[PDB]
Assembly symmetry: C2
Homo-oligomer: 121 residues x 2
Protein backbone atom coordinates (compact mmCIF):
# COMPACT_ATOMS: atom_id res chain seq x y z
CA UNK A 1 0.00 0.00 0.00
CA UNK A 2 1.02 3.59 -0.79
CA UNK A 3 -0.55 4.80 2.49
CA UNK A 4 1.46 2.20 4.38
CA UNK A 5 4.65 2.98 2.42
CA UNK A 6 4.33 6.68 3.32
CA UNK A 7 3.41 5.99 6.97
CA UNK A 8 6.53 3.89 7.47
CA UNK A 9 8.65 6.54 5.70
CA UNK A 10 7.27 9.28 7.95
CA UNK A 11 8.03 7.26 11.03
CA UNK A 12 11.54 6.90 9.68
CA UNK A 13 11.74 10.67 9.17
CA UNK A 14 10.44 11.17 12.70
CA UNK A 15 7.61 13.06 11.04
CA UNK A 16 4.07 12.99 12.39
CA UNK A 17 1.72 11.18 10.02
CA UNK A 18 -1.15 13.43 8.87
CA UNK A 19 -4.69 12.19 9.53
CA UNK A 20 -5.00 12.40 5.77
CA UNK A 21 -2.52 10.61 3.50
CA UNK A 22 -3.08 12.86 0.46
CA UNK A 23 -2.45 11.66 -3.12
CA UNK A 24 0.72 13.76 -3.45
CA UNK A 25 2.84 14.03 -0.33
CA UNK A 26 5.19 16.95 0.16
CA UNK A 27 8.40 16.46 2.10
CA UNK A 28 11.09 19.13 2.43
CA UNK A 29 14.65 17.90 3.09
CA UNK A 30 16.83 20.83 4.12
CA UNK A 31 16.35 23.40 1.36
CA UNK A 32 14.85 20.78 -0.97
CA UNK A 33 11.10 20.50 -1.43
CA UNK A 34 10.25 17.01 -2.66
CA UNK A 35 7.01 15.39 -3.83
CA UNK A 36 6.00 11.77 -3.37
CA UNK A 37 3.19 9.94 -5.19
CA UNK A 38 2.11 6.68 -6.87
CA UNK A 39 2.49 7.04 -10.66
CA UNK A 40 1.80 4.91 -12.47
CA UNK A 41 -0.15 2.48 -10.29
CA UNK A 42 2.24 0.19 -8.47
CA UNK A 43 5.17 2.64 -8.75
CA UNK A 44 6.49 5.14 -6.20
CA UNK A 45 7.61 8.37 -7.93
CA UNK A 46 9.59 11.05 -6.10
CA UNK A 47 10.52 14.42 -7.65
CA UNK A 48 11.93 17.86 -6.92
CA UNK A 49 12.61 21.12 -8.79
CA UNK A 50 16.38 21.63 -8.84
CA UNK A 51 18.21 24.93 -9.38
CA UNK A 52 20.60 24.45 -12.26
CA UNK A 53 23.92 26.07 -13.00
CA UNK A 54 23.73 28.47 -15.92
CA UNK A 55 27.17 27.43 -17.07
CA UNK A 56 26.31 23.70 -17.34
CA UNK A 57 25.79 22.87 -21.01
CA UNK A 58 23.71 20.09 -22.51
CA UNK A 59 26.36 17.33 -22.56
CA UNK A 60 27.16 18.18 -18.96
CA UNK A 61 23.50 18.10 -17.99
CA UNK A 62 22.71 14.90 -19.89
CA UNK A 63 25.74 13.20 -18.33
CA UNK A 64 23.87 13.03 -15.01
CA UNK A 65 21.41 10.61 -16.65
CA UNK A 66 23.76 7.81 -17.74
CA UNK A 67 22.75 4.40 -16.33
CA UNK A 68 24.64 3.23 -13.25
CA UNK A 69 24.72 0.46 -10.66
CA UNK A 70 22.20 2.34 -8.54
CA UNK A 71 18.67 2.05 -9.95
CA UNK A 72 17.51 4.86 -7.65
CA UNK A 73 19.86 7.36 -9.21
CA UNK A 74 17.60 10.26 -10.18
CA UNK A 75 16.94 11.49 -13.69
CA UNK A 76 17.21 15.16 -14.74
CA UNK A 77 14.41 16.21 -17.10
CA UNK A 78 12.54 19.37 -18.16
CA UNK A 79 8.86 20.22 -17.71
CA UNK A 80 7.75 22.20 -20.78
CA UNK A 81 4.35 22.97 -19.29
CA UNK A 82 5.68 24.61 -16.16
CA UNK A 83 8.87 25.68 -17.95
CA UNK A 84 11.44 24.32 -15.49
CA UNK A 85 13.72 21.37 -14.72
CA UNK A 86 12.53 18.28 -12.91
CA UNK A 87 14.64 15.74 -11.08
CA UNK A 88 12.94 12.42 -10.33
CA UNK A 89 13.33 8.76 -9.45
CA UNK A 90 11.06 5.79 -9.15
CA UNK A 91 10.73 2.16 -7.88
CA UNK A 92 8.07 -0.56 -7.72
CA UNK A 93 5.79 -0.56 -4.69
CA UNK A 94 5.75 -4.34 -4.82
CA UNK A 95 9.48 -4.60 -4.11
CA UNK A 96 10.16 -2.28 -1.19
CA UNK A 97 12.20 -3.26 1.83
CA UNK A 98 11.73 -1.33 5.10
CA UNK A 99 14.41 1.12 3.94
CA UNK A 100 13.61 1.49 0.22
CA UNK A 101 11.67 4.78 0.39
CA UNK A 102 14.09 6.52 2.78
CA UNK A 103 16.87 5.54 0.47
CA UNK A 104 15.01 6.73 -2.60
CA UNK A 105 14.46 10.10 -0.95
CA UNK A 106 18.13 10.41 0.08
CA UNK A 107 19.26 9.44 -3.40
CA UNK A 108 16.89 12.02 -4.89
CA UNK A 109 18.34 14.77 -2.62
CA UNK A 110 21.99 13.85 -3.21
CA UNK A 111 21.07 14.03 -6.89
CA UNK A 112 19.86 17.58 -6.34
CA UNK A 113 23.04 18.44 -4.46
CA UNK A 114 25.11 17.26 -7.42
CA UNK A 115 23.45 19.85 -9.61
CA UNK A 116 18.98 15.86 7.51
CA UNK A 117 16.16 18.07 8.78
CA UNK A 118 12.71 17.14 7.46
CA UNK A 119 9.44 19.07 7.32
CA UNK A 120 5.95 17.76 6.54
CA UNK A 121 5.68 19.64 3.26
Amino acid sequence: SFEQAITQLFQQLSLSIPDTIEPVIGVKVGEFACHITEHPVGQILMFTLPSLDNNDEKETLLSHNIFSQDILKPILSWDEVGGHPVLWNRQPLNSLDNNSLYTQLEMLVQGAERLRSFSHH
Copy 2:
Protein backbone atom coordinates in the same frame (compact mmCIF):
# COMPACT_ATOMS: atom_id res chain seq x y z
CA UNK B 1 17.43 -16.20 -15.85
CA UNK B 2 19.27 -13.86 -18.21
CA UNK B 3 19.95 -16.60 -20.70
CA UNK B 4 16.33 -17.85 -20.79
CA UNK B 5 14.85 -14.35 -21.11
CA UNK B 6 16.99 -13.63 -24.15
CA UNK B 7 16.21 -17.05 -25.57
CA UNK B 8 12.49 -16.25 -25.45
CA UNK B 9 13.03 -12.79 -26.95
CA UNK B 10 15.03 -14.26 -29.81
CA UNK B 11 12.38 -16.83 -30.51
CA UNK B 12 9.91 -13.98 -30.56
CA UNK B 13 12.12 -11.96 -32.94
CA UNK B 14 12.52 -15.04 -35.16
CA UNK B 15 16.29 -14.90 -34.56
CA UNK B 16 18.34 -18.06 -34.13
CA UNK B 17 19.63 -18.93 -30.67
CA UNK B 18 23.34 -18.12 -30.81
CA UNK B 19 24.97 -21.23 -29.22
CA UNK B 20 26.46 -19.20 -26.35
CA UNK B 21 24.73 -16.12 -24.88
CA UNK B 22 27.25 -13.31 -24.31
CA UNK B 23 27.03 -10.73 -21.49
CA UNK B 24 26.10 -7.98 -23.95
CA UNK B 25 23.70 -9.05 -26.70
CA UNK B 26 23.34 -7.04 -29.90
CA UNK B 27 20.07 -6.86 -31.85
CA UNK B 28 19.35 -4.60 -34.83
CA UNK B 29 15.82 -3.27 -35.31
CA UNK B 30 15.48 -1.41 -38.62
CA UNK B 31 18.27 1.17 -38.60
CA UNK B 32 18.70 0.98 -34.79
CA UNK B 33 21.57 -1.06 -33.37
CA UNK B 34 20.56 -2.01 -29.80
CA UNK B 35 22.33 -3.68 -26.88
CA UNK B 36 20.86 -5.91 -24.16
CA UNK B 37 22.70 -6.79 -20.94
CA UNK B 38 22.20 -7.56 -17.28
CA UNK B 39 23.36 -4.49 -15.30
CA UNK B 40 23.28 -4.32 -12.40
CA UNK B 41 22.60 -7.92 -11.41
CA UNK B 42 18.89 -8.56 -11.57
CA UNK B 43 18.22 -5.82 -14.14
CA UNK B 44 17.71 -5.92 -17.89
CA UNK B 45 19.47 -2.91 -19.42
CA UNK B 46 18.87 -2.01 -23.08
CA UNK B 47 20.59 0.90 -24.80
CA UNK B 48 21.25 2.37 -28.23
CA UNK B 49 23.40 5.23 -29.42
CA UNK B 50 21.08 7.82 -30.95
CA UNK B 51 21.76 10.55 -33.49
CA UNK B 52 20.85 13.94 -32.05
CA UNK B 53 19.45 17.00 -33.82
CA UNK B 54 22.16 19.56 -33.09
CA UNK B 55 19.53 22.29 -33.28
CA UNK B 56 17.95 20.91 -30.12
CA UNK B 57 18.67 22.97 -27.05
CA UNK B 58 19.14 21.58 -23.52
CA UNK B 59 15.48 22.21 -22.59
CA UNK B 60 14.14 20.28 -25.57
CA UNK B 61 16.54 17.34 -25.11
CA UNK B 62 15.78 17.01 -21.38
CA UNK B 63 12.07 17.18 -22.08
CA UNK B 64 12.32 13.65 -23.42
CA UNK B 65 13.20 12.44 -19.93
CA UNK B 66 10.10 13.71 -18.10
CA UNK B 67 8.26 10.95 -16.19
CA UNK B 68 5.22 9.25 -17.71
CA UNK B 69 2.85 6.36 -17.10
CA UNK B 70 5.14 4.05 -19.01
CA UNK B 71 8.13 2.89 -16.94
CA UNK B 72 9.86 1.49 -20.09
CA UNK B 73 10.04 4.98 -21.62
CA UNK B 74 13.75 5.49 -22.36
CA UNK B 75 16.12 8.05 -20.89
CA UNK B 76 18.38 10.33 -22.92
CA UNK B 77 21.89 10.73 -21.49
CA UNK B 78 25.54 11.42 -22.37
CA UNK B 79 28.62 9.18 -22.02
CA UNK B 80 31.58 11.42 -21.12
CA UNK B 81 34.23 8.90 -22.02
CA UNK B 82 32.62 7.65 -25.20
CA UNK B 83 31.88 11.25 -26.15
CA UNK B 84 28.35 10.49 -27.40
CA UNK B 85 24.67 10.40 -26.42
CA UNK B 86 23.06 7.28 -24.95
CA UNK B 87 19.39 6.24 -24.90
CA UNK B 88 18.44 3.46 -22.49
CA UNK B 89 15.74 1.80 -20.45
CA UNK B 90 15.66 -0.88 -17.77
CA UNK B 91 13.39 -3.24 -15.86
CA UNK B 92 13.77 -5.92 -13.18
CA UNK B 93 14.56 -9.41 -14.45
CA UNK B 94 12.38 -10.87 -11.65
CA UNK B 95 9.09 -9.41 -12.85
CA UNK B 96 9.14 -10.05 -16.57
CA UNK B 97 6.15 -11.40 -18.47
CA UNK B 98 6.46 -13.21 -21.84
CA UNK B 99 6.06 -9.82 -23.53
CA UNK B 100 8.32 -7.77 -21.27
CA UNK B 101 11.63 -7.78 -23.17
CA UNK B 102 9.89 -7.49 -26.53
CA UNK B 103 7.97 -4.45 -25.30
CA UNK B 104 11.04 -2.93 -23.65
CA UNK B 105 12.91 -3.09 -26.96
CA UNK B 106 10.01 -1.56 -28.91
CA UNK B 107 9.80 1.29 -26.41
CA UNK B 108 13.55 1.82 -26.80
CA UNK B 109 13.27 1.97 -30.58
CA UNK B 110 10.32 4.36 -30.39
CA UNK B 111 12.28 6.72 -28.16
CA UNK B 112 15.12 6.68 -30.69
CA UNK B 113 12.64 7.57 -33.43
CA UNK B 114 11.21 10.39 -31.33
CA UNK B 115 14.71 11.93 -31.17
CA UNK B 116 14.75 12.33 -34.95
CA UNK B 117 9.97 -4.30 -37.67
CA UNK B 118 12.94 -6.04 -39.25
CA UNK B 119 15.14 -7.83 -36.69
CA UNK B 120 18.66 -9.17 -37.10
CA UNK B 121 21.61 -10.23 -34.98
CA UNK B 122 24.18 -7.47 -34.56
